[PDB]
Amino acid sequence: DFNTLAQNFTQFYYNQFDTDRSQLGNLYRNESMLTFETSQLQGAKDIVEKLVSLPFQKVQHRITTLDAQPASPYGDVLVMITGDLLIDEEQNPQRFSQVFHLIPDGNSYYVFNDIFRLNYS
Amino acid sequence: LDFNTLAQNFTQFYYNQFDTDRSQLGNLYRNESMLTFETSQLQGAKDIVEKLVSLPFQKVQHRITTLDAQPASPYGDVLVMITGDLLIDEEQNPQRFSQVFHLIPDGNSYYVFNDIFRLNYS
């Protein structure tokens, strides 16, 4: 159910991030907030700017866990993801944790909350 | 921060109770609250607490590595993501985890509406 909906949107999101992150703007809105580790941004413009500023040439997201729950009785969804992030030609991946608060929009969603952290052992 | 501080005030309270006696956490959940613990899905304070209590370990201590929060909507609720370690049975062998809480205001405190928990192998 919510896992399927979250699976579809989340996969679409990461596919776009790994393909061309400069085109992620349409998945965010003016009210959207991104906490990228220690960086705090608001709005599609600043959010995408931060993601594009990441100095890597290639990146691959590898999901290891995905869980979703309705965030309220009104259609919004909370999704938590953990996985591996392969940067450039690096052999050893970096662990990450991310949470999205998705708001219904048309036949899909837009991201209201985006919290991202790389996790170190 | 602001929300990080607000979220921290509550999360510390929550983990303090979890670490002393998790069977007493019911007051922090409600009928509609949902817990997803390693895919196991529970709803309501009774079932949620039963799950936490059923966890196979006597002593447990949470060590927080990162805590990040944001307002979940413009109206007062908070979203917080935590990454940390779980130390059980006084063992010096950390069990890493990631957790997300969707907190709803209640007086000067909050209750947990969404709780998602995952072990995160180190």
Side-chain angles (χ1 to χ4, degrees), chain A residues 2-89 92-106 108-121, chain B residues 1-91 93-122:
Chain A
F2 303 81
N3 272 182
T4 300
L5 298 173
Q7 183 65 40
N8 296 328
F9 187 80
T10 299
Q11 281 185 292
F12 181 89
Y13 181 94
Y14 291 134
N15 284 169
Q16 185 58 263
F17 191 116
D18 298 349
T19 297
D20 188 357
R21 55 196 187 287
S22 71
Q23 301 306 303
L24 287 173
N26 59 171
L27 300 184
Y28 290 99
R29 298 289 186 278
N30 297 319
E31 59 264 39
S32 300
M33 297 162 275
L34 165 66
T35 291
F36 189 95
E37 308 210 281
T38 58
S39 300
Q40 287 170 52
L41 301 311
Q42 295 182 58
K45 180 181 177 179
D46 293 344
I47 290 176
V48 175
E49 187 187 14
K50 172 60 182 182
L51 301 183
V52 168
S53 72
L54 299 171
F56 51 71
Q57 300 300 71
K58 294 182 178 179
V59 67
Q60 178 177 61
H61 280 79
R62 288 310 312 163
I63 295 178
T64 55
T65 71
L66 182 153
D67 298 285
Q69 297 181 347
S72 80
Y74 305 102
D76 51 326
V77 184
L78 188 58
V79 184
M80 183 175 89
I81 304 97
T82 66
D84 296 341
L85 193 66
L86 286 175
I87 309 173
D88 289 345
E89 298 299 298
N92 294 303
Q94 292 306 314
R95 289 294 297 175
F96 80 87
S97 290
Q98 183 155 208
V99 58
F100 292 121
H101 178 7
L102 307 175
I103 309 303
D105 187 88
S108 193
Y109 303 88
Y110 76 81
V111 180
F112 182 82
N113 295 292
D114 179 351
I115 301 173
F116 175 87
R117 276 288 185 177
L118 280 187
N119 320 305
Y120 302 88
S121 57
Chain B
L1 228 305
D2 186 303
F3 287 93
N4 279 8
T5 297
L6 295 177
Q8 194 189 200
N9 290 335
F10 184 83
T11 62
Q12 298 181 313
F13 182 90
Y14 179 95
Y15 291 136
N16 260 324
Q17 184 156 62
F18 192 115
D19 297 352
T20 54
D21 188 341
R22 54 191 186 284
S23 74
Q24 297 186 46
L25 289 167
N27 314 264
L28 296 183
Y29 290 99
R30 299 289 187 276
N31 296 321
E32 297 304 298
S33 297
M34 298 158 276
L35 163 66
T36 296
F37 192 104
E38 276 298 331
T39 78
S40 182
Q41 302 180 302
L42 300 307
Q43 193 184 311
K46 182 180 176 180
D47 296 339
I48 291 172
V49 173
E50 181 181 2
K51 173 62 176 178
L52 298 181
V53 169
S54 73
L55 288 176
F57 54 67
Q58 306 178 66
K59 296 185 179 180
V60 63
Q61 184 181 305
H62 285 73
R63 298 203 292 84
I64 310 305
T65 302
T66 66
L67 183 157
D68 299 293
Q70 297 184 346
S73 81
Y75 313 104
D77 47 332
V78 181
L79 181 69
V80 58
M81 182 179 81
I82 299 109
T83 64
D85 289 344
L86 221 52
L87 292 177
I88 71 172
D89 297 354
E90 302 177 56
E91 290 292 354
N93 184 180
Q95 176 78 292
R96 191 168 61 175
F97 74 88
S98 285
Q99 185 160 206
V100 163
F101 292 120
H102 176 15
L103 308 171
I104 306 301
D106 189 300
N108 296 304
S109 190
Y110 302 83
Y111 72 78
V112 183
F113 186 74
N114 293 291
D115 182 344
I116 300 178
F117 180 92
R118 280 289 190 176
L119 295 178
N120 198 171
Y121 179 65
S122 300

